[PDB]
Design a protein around this ligand. Structure first.
Ligand SMILES: CN(CCO)c1ccc(/C=C(\C#N)c2ccc(C#N)cc2)cc1
Ligand SMILES: [Mg+2]
Ligand SMILES: [Mg+2]
Ligand code: NA
Lengths: 213, 224
RNA sequence: GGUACCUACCAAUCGUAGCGUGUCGACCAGCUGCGAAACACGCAGCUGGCACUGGCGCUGUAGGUAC
């Protein structure tokens, strides 16, 4: 089986930067290499075929080259719409092989998160569970630390985080941290707090509520 | 006007079977090579199988050899992928793809379908519970409010969440579903809005889970 | 006696009595262009084998035939 080792796995570049993405075939695949672009949730789109031929319709800033077993996709100047995951593929012999992919995200200035805290609705409480939500909105970069506190008791192992893809309008991220408790455990505590640490915050920001207010 | 449309995805149990179809329009499949390529959630593309024209010769990946069978009918411009002895690691979105013409785009896949989701799990289908995330009327600045909906305890993917039946879209963030320890999925869809409109604007979240044929609408408004 | 044709000339080596010749074509494998075409299949060109086809040129030994 012919393998295609793709690098890097990801990168954050600013508009106008040149980007190079390499794929190394385990053995010779002649020039039967293609490059594809995939937006999140959409089907891939053919960028390059035969290692270096530009598919009809693809802007000229995309280019592909071969040197032995090394294949390189170059975006001369990164446009804001080039946000995507790029994949290489060998079709020299069966079975075909895709690279692991390279996720290209867009850089931007640091943006602090807007923090919100949401207690569990009574409707849910009547079912025997309590979900407390902490929302971090419109921040950059993606790195952020969320810490839950119940009556100043550090929580761990009872929360889950989920992050959106970079927003196409402002290039920021949004994160949700959900803390799950039993109805009893919830109604036997008062102070519920979410502490957020992020690069664009001089000090951690805490949002909290007292159960019943 | 080339187009590929997949169908047949759904939920099945380990050891089960399922047949996906790929209907082509704008061209005849018998004159092109047809490929099936899969993508697991948050993972890279994986070539699954392919079938060549004129010969009908078929090729498969190592991880599906002996379990999957690719075929095609011309008197019904369609291709098919039968999957037997399905395993958990076969869960993914499956794309139908056309290999381009030899003298125009080499061996590149120039046309792809939208993809169809195949889930392989022993868990049972279940619709979500939609709870509100009410805007904090207590302690809220002018023009800065956040409200949302929590879609909890459902399986399998996907659920779609809209706001005001499609009218409200600016500032909406619907997070990717996370799998809970219970084996069920949960997510939240939030939206930011000026607080001045909190009392004079009714906010609806429309959640929909197709596998369970569940369609719920939840009003989100302050509390007490 | 001469010319022409014909029949035979150990073994091995394609063949031949022997020497040289590898042919429209046939077969094996490979490469390339093209056929809606990665494999298979069709058309064409080329490369290396092979000698199925056993022809062609030269040149004998006898026997025979014709003149
Ligand atoms: C160089 N050499 C010695 C060994 O390599 C050769 C040996 C034999 C040949 C054979 C032929 C030629 N040309 C041939 C064969 C059959 C027919 C028929 N019907 C026609 C011609 C060529 C060369
Ligand atoms: Mg002899
Ligand atoms: Mg012979
Ligand atoms: Na010949």
């Amino acid at each position: 089986d012919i393998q295609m080792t793709q690098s890097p796995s990801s990168l954050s570049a600013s508009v106008g930067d040149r980007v190079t993405i390499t794929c190394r075939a385990s053995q010779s695949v002649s020039s039967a290499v293609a490059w594809y672009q995939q937006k999140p949730g959409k089907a891939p789109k053919l960028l390059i075929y035969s290692a270096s031929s530009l598919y009809s319709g693809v802007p000229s800033r995309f280019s592909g080259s071969r040197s032995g077993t090394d294949f390189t996709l170059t975006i001369s100047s990164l446009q804001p719409e080039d946000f995507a995951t790029y994949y290489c593929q060998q079709s020299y012999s069966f079975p075909s092989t895709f690279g692991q992919g390279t996720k290209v995200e867009i850089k931007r200035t640091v943006a602090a998160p807007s923090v919100f805290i949401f207690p569990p609705s009574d409707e849910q409480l009547k079912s025997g569970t309590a979900s407390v939500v902490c929302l971090l909105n419109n921040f950059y970069p993606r790195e952020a630390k969320v810490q839950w506190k119940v009556d100043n008791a550090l929580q761990s192992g009872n929360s889950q985080e989920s992050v959106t893809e970079q927003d196409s309008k402002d290039s920021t991220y949004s994160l949700s941290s959900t803390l799950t408790l039993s109805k009893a455990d919830y109604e036997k505590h008062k102070v519920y707090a979410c502490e957020v640490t992020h690069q664009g915050l001089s000090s951690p920001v805490t949002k909290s509520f007292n159960r019943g207010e | 006007e080339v187009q590929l449309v997949e169908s047949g995805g759904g939920l099945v149990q380990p050891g089960g079977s399922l047949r996906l179809s790929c209907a082509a329009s704008g061209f005849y499949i018998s004159y092109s090579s047809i490929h099936w390529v899969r993508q697991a959630p948050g993972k890279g593309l994986e070539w699954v199988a392919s079938i060549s024209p004129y010969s009908g010769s078929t090729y498969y990946a190592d991880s599906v050899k002996g379990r999957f069978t690719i075929s095609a009918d011309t008197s019904k411009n369609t291709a098919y992928l039968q999957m037997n002895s399905l395993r958990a690691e076969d869960t993914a979105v499956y794309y139908c793809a056309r290999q381009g013409y030899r003298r125009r785009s080499g061996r590149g896949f120039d046309y792809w379908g939208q993809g169809t989701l195949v889930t392989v799990s022993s868990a049972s289908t279940k619709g979500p519970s939609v709870f509100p995330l009410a805007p904090s009327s207590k302690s809220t600045s002018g023009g800065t409010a956040a409200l949302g909906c929590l879609v909890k305890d459902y399986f399998p993917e996907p659920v779609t969440v809209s706001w005001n039946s499609g009218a409200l879209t600016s500032g909406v963030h619907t997070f990717p579903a996370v799998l809970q320890s219970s084996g069920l999925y949960s997510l939240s869809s939030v939206v930011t809005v000026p607080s001045s409109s909190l009392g004079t604007q009714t906010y609806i979240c429309n959640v929909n889970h197709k596998p369970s044929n569940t369609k719920v609408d939840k009003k989100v408004e302050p509390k007490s």
